[PDB]
C-alpha cells in the first residue's frame, strides 16, 4: 500500500548520488521538488524488498521521517518518489564542517534520531539502515529527517551486508534490536564528524572485527549510551523509550 | 579603510568566472572564500576597486555579501563564498519552473539590502542578477530563497563608455554620458527575474542598446507598476526603497 506515480508526473534532474542498487536524482513531481531513487534492473525479490520499503514509509507519519510520495515503474526501472530535503545527507555535511560542529548541535540530532526510532519501535517496525548518510538535514538548532532504508536488508547479499559494517548489527551478518546498533554506530559517526570507525578497513578486516566480537571505540556525554547500544547481545540493548528519556 | 590580507593567508583554486576587469576564483583564507583578481590595471582602476572594498568593509546587512579585505601588481578582493552562486545562472537552469512567490521573496530581500544602502546614502552602482548570490535555494516545502547582494566590483565611475554600454539595461540612463541609479538597476533586475534570467536587450548590439537609451525607449512590462516607476528616465521621479520595500 503505496501510491502509484505515472512517469508523466515526474521530471528527472541531476544525479545526487548512489544507494544500494540505486541511483539517486533530484526531480519534480506535478509542482514539488522531489528525490528519485532509481532501482537498478532487478529480479522480483529485490523489487519486492524495494516495494516493502515504499509500503513501510507510506504507512508512517513522523516529523523526523522523510515522506514517500509513491512508486513509478519506467521500463525495467522502479522509482521511489521521495521527499527532497534542503541540505542533504548528514555525513557529507559533517566531513565538510569537521572540527567546527558543537557538541550541543550533535545532541539535538541524536534526540531527533532517537525520537524517530522510538516511534518506529512503538509500531514494532524495523528501519534496518540507520547511518549518517540516511540522516537528511532540513535545517542546519538542526532539523533532521531519517530517509527510507532503500532495498530492505533481507534481500541483500553477504558482500553488501559486510559493506554496511559498522552500522550493520552483528546478528545480521549471518528485530527492532538491530536499529539500536545502527543508532549507536551513527552516534560514533556523528561524534567523529562523519568519520565512522572501520571505514578504512577491508571487507575481511570488517568481517574479522565482528567474528572476533571486537567492540567499537568510545566516542563524553554519549559514551555510556553508545556502549549499551553497541553490544553483541541484542536483548541487552536499551529501548528507544530509555534512550530518548536519557537524552532529556 | 578595509583589511589588508597577505598573500601567505590566501590560496587560489577553481576559476568561477569573470567580472568587469576581474577573474573570479574559489579560494581559501587562513575559510572558503571567493577571490576577485583584478586584471593588470592603471591606478584609477585599482583605486576604484579599493573604494568598493572600503564601502563593503564599512557595511553590515544579512543580504549583503561580506568583504574580508584586499591583497596587494596584483589586486585581490577576498570576499564571502555563497553556496549556489549567481541568480541569473540559476534562473536560466530552472526556466519555467520558478514560482512567482519565490521571485517576490528575492525582490523583498534585494529592496531590503538597497533600502539599507539608501538610508546610509551609499551607492551600489551594479545591481543585476549576476551580482545576486543564492545562499539558500528555497526548493523544499516551507523553505524560501536567501540572497546576498555581491560587492559592485570596479566602481562605475572608472569604467569606459564601451563597458557602460555593455551594462545596458541595468545601467541607469543618466550614467551613459546618485542613489537614484540603484532604483533603475533594481527595476531592470526585477524584469530579469520575471523573465527567468533573460534580461531585455541582451541579444541587442552595443549601437542598438545605446540607440534604445538615446531615443528614450522604455523597457517591456514584466510587479508591472513597481518596475515602470523604477525604470523612468527622470531619476527624481523614481520611488524610494522605503516606498518599494513597504509596497
Ligand atoms: C528521502 N529522500 C532522500 O533520501 C534525500 C532527500 N533530500 C536530499 N537532498 C539533497 C540536497 C542537496 C544535495 F547536494 C544532495 N541531496 C537527498 C536525499 N538522498 C540522497 C542524496 C544523495 C546521496 C544519497 C542520498 S540517500 C539518503 O538516498 O542515500
Ligand atoms: C562576493 N562574492 C561573490 O561574488 C561570489 C560568491 N559566491 C559565489 N559562489 C559560487 C558557487 C557556485 C558556483 F558554481 C559559482 N559561484 C560566486 C561569487 N561570484 C561570482 C562567481 C562567478 C561569476 C561571477 C561572480 S561575481 C558576483 O563576482 O560577478
From Swiss-Prot, chain B:
Keywords: ATP-binding, Kinase, Nucleotide-binding, Phosphoprotein, Repeat, SH2 domain, Transferase, Tyrosine-protein kinase
GO cellular component term of the entry, any: interleukin-12 receptor complex
Description of post-translational modifications: Phosphorylated.
Residue numbers of Phosphotyrosine PTMs: 25
Cystine connections: none
Family: Belongs to the protein kinase superfamily. Tyr protein kinase family. JAK subfamily.
Protein name (record): Non-receptor tyrosine-protein kinase TYK2
Effect of residue 124 to R: In a colorectal adenocarcinoma sample; somatic mutation
Biological processes per GO annotation: cell differentiation; cell population proliferation; cell surface receptor signaling pathway via JAK-STAT; cellular response to virus; cytokine-mediated signaling pathway; growth hormone receptor signaling pathway via JAK-STAT; immune response; interleukin-10-mediated signaling pathway
Tissue expression: Observed in all cell lines analyzed. Expressed in a variety of lymphoid and non-lymphoid cell lines.
Molecular function in Gene Ontology: ATP binding; growth hormone receptor binding; non-membrane spanning protein tyrosine kinase activity; protein tyrosine kinase activity
Highest taxon listed in the record's lineage: Eukaryota
Disease: Immunodeficiency 35: A primary immunodeficiency characterized by recurrent skin abscesses, pneumonia, and highly elevated serum IgE.
Quaternary state and interactors: Interacts (via FERM domain) with JAKMIP1. Interacts with PIK3R1; this interaction is important for cell migration. Interacts with MPL/TPOR. (Microbial infection) Interacts with Epstein-Barr virus protein LMP1; this interaction inhibits TYK2-mediated interferon signaling.
Role played: Tyrosine kinase of the non-receptor type involved in numerous cytokines and interferons signaling, which regulates cell growth, development, cell migration, innate and adaptive immunity. Plays both structural and catalytic roles in numerous interleukins and interferons (IFN-alpha/beta) signaling. Associates with heterodimeric cytokine receptor complexes and activates STAT family members including STAT1, STAT3, STAT4 or STAT6.
Domain Protein kinase: 10-247
Amino acid at each position: 500500500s503505496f501510491h502509484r506515480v505515472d512517469q508523466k508526473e515526474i521530471t528527472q534532474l541531476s544525479h545526487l548520488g548512489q544507494g544500494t542498487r540505486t541511483n539517486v536524482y533530484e526531480g519534480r513531481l506535478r509542482e514539488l521538488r522531489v528525490v528519485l531513487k532509481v532501482l537498478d534492473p532487478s529480479h522480483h525479490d529485490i523489487a519486492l524488498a524495494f516495494y516493502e520499503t515504499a509500503s513501510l514509509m507510506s504507512q508512517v507519519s513522523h516529523t523526523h521521517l522523510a515522506f514517500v510520495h509513491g512508486v513509478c515503474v519506467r521500463g525495467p526501472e522502479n522509482i521511489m518518489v521521495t521527499e527532497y530535503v534542503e541540505h542533504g545527507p548528514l555525513d557529507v555535511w559533517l566531513r565538510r564542517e569537521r572540527g567546527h560542529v558543537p557538541m550541543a548541535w550533535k545532541m539535538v540530532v541524536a534526540q531527533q534520531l532517537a525520537s524517530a526510532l522510538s516511534y518506529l519501535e512503538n509500531k514494532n517496525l524495523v528501519h534496518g539502515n540507520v547511518c549518517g548518510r540516511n540522516i537528511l538535514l532540513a535545517r542546519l538548532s538542526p532539523f533532521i529527517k531519517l530517509s527510507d532504508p532503500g532495498v530492505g536488508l533481507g534481500a541483500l547479499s553477504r558482500e553488501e551486508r559486510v559493506e554496511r559494517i559498522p552500522w550493520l548489527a552483528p546478528e545480521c551478518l549471518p528485530s527492532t534490536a538491530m536499529d539500536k546498533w545502527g543508532f549507536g554506530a551513527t552516534l560514533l559517526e556523528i561524534c567523529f564528524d562523519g568519520e565512522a570507525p572501520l571505514q578504512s578497513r577491508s571487507p575481511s578486516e570488517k568481517e574479522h572485527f565482528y567474528q572476533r566480537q571486537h567492540r567499537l571505540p568510545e566516542p563524553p556525554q554519549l559514551a555510556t549510551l553508545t556502549s549499551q547500544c553497541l553490544t553483541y547481545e541484542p536483548t541487552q540493548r536499551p529501548s528507544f523509550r530509555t534512550i530518548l528519556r536519557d537524552l532529556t
